[PDB]
């Protein structure tokens, strides 16, 4: 049901947060974009590698900016065509095609926020540290699942942790909408079992 995928509640809330009881000046999905823009992990992306480490060649921020635009264009078309297909969404709840575009843009913007430096080699180095390095000393003290993470460090999990990191005085981190978090997650599964099928959503965790 599409009425449930477009959730507006955030962590620590207790009310319903209905769509028809909100001001159109600043939508909840637009607040997510504003919060991500002003964040420090997002600002640190200007110094990270796309392809060529360390000019007119793209970095991790421009890449995100470009994706934030293309995905917004895709999501706005998709939302327009759904509303065309489903009329009850714009008659009872009060949804518009800008909502999908905003959600996809917010998800697109922070989709590469937790990647380690030096691009593709950083995650491999982190994984190999706990396999053919000193980190193998910690193998006996950890369970199978925890050791799996560490030896298979991922950028998506790190990005989710950065987005939802709780700190004293700031519960929930950036406190983004649940729809944005759902759209951001590409592999909704744990680290084990390792590649149980040929599906697109179980290659990694």
């Amino acid at each position: 049901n599409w009425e449930h995928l477009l959730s507006l509640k955030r962590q620590g809330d207790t009310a319903k947060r209905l769509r028809i009881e909100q001001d159109d000046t600043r939508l909840g999905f637009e607040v997510d974009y504003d919060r991500i823009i002003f964040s420090a992990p997002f600002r640190s992306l200007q110094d990270k590698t796309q392809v060529i480490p360390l000019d007119f060649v793209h970095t991790r921020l421009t890449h995100s900016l470009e994706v934030s635009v293309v995905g917004r264009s895709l999501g706005r078309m998709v939302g327009k065509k759904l509303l065309e297909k489903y009329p009850h969404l714009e008659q009872v709840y009060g949804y518009k095609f800008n909502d999908f575009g905003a959600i996809v843009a917010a998800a697109a913007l922070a989709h590469d926020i937790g990647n380690p430096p030096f691009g593709h080699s950083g995650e491999k180095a982190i994984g190999e540290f706990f396999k053919n390095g000193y980190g193998k000393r910690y193998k006996d003290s950890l369970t199978a699942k925890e050791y799996q993470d560490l030896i298979k460090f991922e950028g998506n999990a790190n990005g989710f942790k950065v987005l939802s990191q709780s700190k004293p005085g700031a519960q929930g981190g950036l406190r983004l909408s649940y729809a944005t978090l759902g759209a951001f997650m590409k592999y909704p599964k744990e680290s084990l079992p390792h590649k149980p099928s040929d599906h697109i959503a179980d290659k990694k965790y």
Partner: protein, 225 residues
């Protein structure tokens, strides 16, 4: 003089040339090898001496004192004294010593032609020459003050470390060609099926191919410096 992987080629060369068998395979020296050895010996002994003299590590007093009998009956004192810079005088002495050593080496080689061709000659041509005390003194002075300088020792230690890390990296890359880092090293160092002994000798040859500057740059940029 040769590895195990080139035994057949040198055996064919020896069989064709006609070198006398001595024993494990071993043959006798070519007389032209004696000539090459003598020529090479005279060059480094004299050129290293003069290079040490101009760089600031040896005084011209040793240049004149140690080179007196070599340049004795070949020098013109008026021309020698007419020169002003030390470089011309050193070149002048170097020029005269090389000529006299060449002539003496030719005479020594022609003295022992039958023994050399028969393979019974057990020494070189320089060591069987009249002028040996001066050569020994020059070599000892070069060992004392040229080969033991601080810069030479520092550069030798640096090369010592650089070759050590390069060899260990190549061996680690060769051992298990499974990890991504090993593949990266293989793509960088050796981007161009054999047994273990050939694999190691090829690694050694590849390391020996690099120059000083290339090896230094590779060592700095493998460390991110």
């Amino acid at each position: 003089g040769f590895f195990q992987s080139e035994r057949a080629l040198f055996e064919d060369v020896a069989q064709e040339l006609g070198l006398l068998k001595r024993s494990d395979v071993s043959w006798s020296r070519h007389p032209l090898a004696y000539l090459v050895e003598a020529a090479d010996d005279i060059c480094y002994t004299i050129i290293d001496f003069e290079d040490g003299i101009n760089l600031g590590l040896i005084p011209e007093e040793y240049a004149l004192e140690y080179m007196v009998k070599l340049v004795g009956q070949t020098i013109d004192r008026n021309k020698y004294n007419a020169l002003q810079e030390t470089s011309d005088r050193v070149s002048y002495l170097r020029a005269l010593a090389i000529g006299t050593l060449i002539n003496e080496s030719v005479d020594t080689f022609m003295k022992y032609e039958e023994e050399i061709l028969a393979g019974t000659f057990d020494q070189s041509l320089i060591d069987k020459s009249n002028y040996q005390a001066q050569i020994t003194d020059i070599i000892n002075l070069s060992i004392e003050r040229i080969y033991n300088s601080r810069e030479v020792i520092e550069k030798e230690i640096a090369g010592y470390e650089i070759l050590s890390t390069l060899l260990e990296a190549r061996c680690r890359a060769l051992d298990n060609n499974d990890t991504h880092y090993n593949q990266l090293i293989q793509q960088l160092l050796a981007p161009n099926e054999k047994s273990l002994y050939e694999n190691l000798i090829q690694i050694c040859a590849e390391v020996s191919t690099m120059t000083d500057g290339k090896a230094l740059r590779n060592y700095k940029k493998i460390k991110g410096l």
